[PDB]
Amino acid sequence: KKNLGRIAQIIGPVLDVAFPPGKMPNIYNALIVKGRDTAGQPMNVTCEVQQLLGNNRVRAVAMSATDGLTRGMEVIDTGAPLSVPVGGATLGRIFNVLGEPVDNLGPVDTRTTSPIHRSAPAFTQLDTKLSIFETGIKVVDLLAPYRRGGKIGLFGGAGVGKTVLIMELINNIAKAHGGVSVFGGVGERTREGNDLYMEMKESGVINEQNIAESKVALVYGQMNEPPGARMRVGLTALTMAEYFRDVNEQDVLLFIDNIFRFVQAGSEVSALLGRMPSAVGYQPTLSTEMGSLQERITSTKEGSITSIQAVYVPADDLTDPAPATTFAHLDATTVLSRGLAAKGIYPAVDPLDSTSTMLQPRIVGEEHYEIAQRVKETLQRYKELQDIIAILGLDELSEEDRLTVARARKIERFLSQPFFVAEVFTGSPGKYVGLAETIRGFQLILSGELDSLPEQAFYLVGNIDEATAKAMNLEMESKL
Amino acid sequence: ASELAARMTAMSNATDNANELKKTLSINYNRARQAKITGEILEIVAGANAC
């Protein structure tokens, strides 16, 4: 603090600042430009430094709009990273990376604060809690048991149901959870954030009648922002959760959507900083940045952190390096496919490529694990036989093989549940299925005693009882 | 006997067609992989040369 830096070169989002020869800010400090807007009032464009350029010059990163800054402006160092308010104050307000309440409400308690940049905890302070908790979605319950306090990533494309699934998952989990949640918007649709805002104001988890009684903290660094904002909003949301687990020491929920926009902002700013480009154009500090943001989402003996984050895949090619690194930091993955998304099965979570770490005999029980791997067996058999029946036909197989064909073509329907928030896209009342119901229904489908139902009567039903009701309805409507 | 014989001839012709089609798809796949590797190296060395 108490110095003056000169803007020397502005190539868009990157900034070259010069300082007096002695006093130089550390890396990951927070400058603050005493600039002005088009109206001339003193407006701030907060700024994070990334690199000592040398010859008493540094290269920086602008956290907000660059249009309006001139070569010859002034800037002041804070001597510390971008501090963010923490605690019970930040509960029920929209938040940006600059620690500003964005919703039209008053100021905040500014005395409880903490910096953004920190590291992973002590390795000897890690909680080995592997307890299952019930979600509700049939695929998410049976074939991919979710670790409480473990990280969860929903690998998908654009427009297959990542946001719908995560919104219904908030809807189902946060009301019956035992801890304070935090949602972050990282490079996504603004009106969809407004829809979440209204739909969770009305659904009482904001409980906007009295402030500080809300159990969610909303942060938003969405698409229309400069790459510094999306580059550090995820860090800000994680640091809020880290306060809530380090001093309030309780379980939290942290939904970091969309983490690929964080990595993409890093690449957009990294190509301009002079980095020799890595694979297809991402930064070279890809895996270390992904870990440095990921590894501080963790459990501990003070409180675990459950983290269902939406992660985007370009062109539905899982080979690409940003998902190729994000697979390496996740516990129970979920890979929404374009195949089921175009086929009509909603949710389009592919039963096959999805695979977790909790589904073990000694972690979930023997019969759940057994019926789950038998379901995976039947589906793998069907997608194996697909390329054969593509040209062969339906009448050159065995009774075992055609039996598994019809059974898997029932199963792929049965794993589709009409969500609460899917009513606008489906037209079906609210359904929430139990785990016992799912395992019982899959034993009813697999054990052969349902080979006489209508095959289309398994689609978007909640219970296997409702599948029997669909069979009765369809046969009654056909026979009149 | 005649229908099993005619079906045997049809299966043999399908196996020959699948042979030729497999060879052509292999040629095109090798070409696609080569052009993809070349495009990657080109864009990488271009982005590096830029800086």
Partner: peptide, 11 residues
Amino acid sequence: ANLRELRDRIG
């Protein structure tokens, strides 16, 4: 996603 569907069609 091109090489993936290419290899899978070969198989």
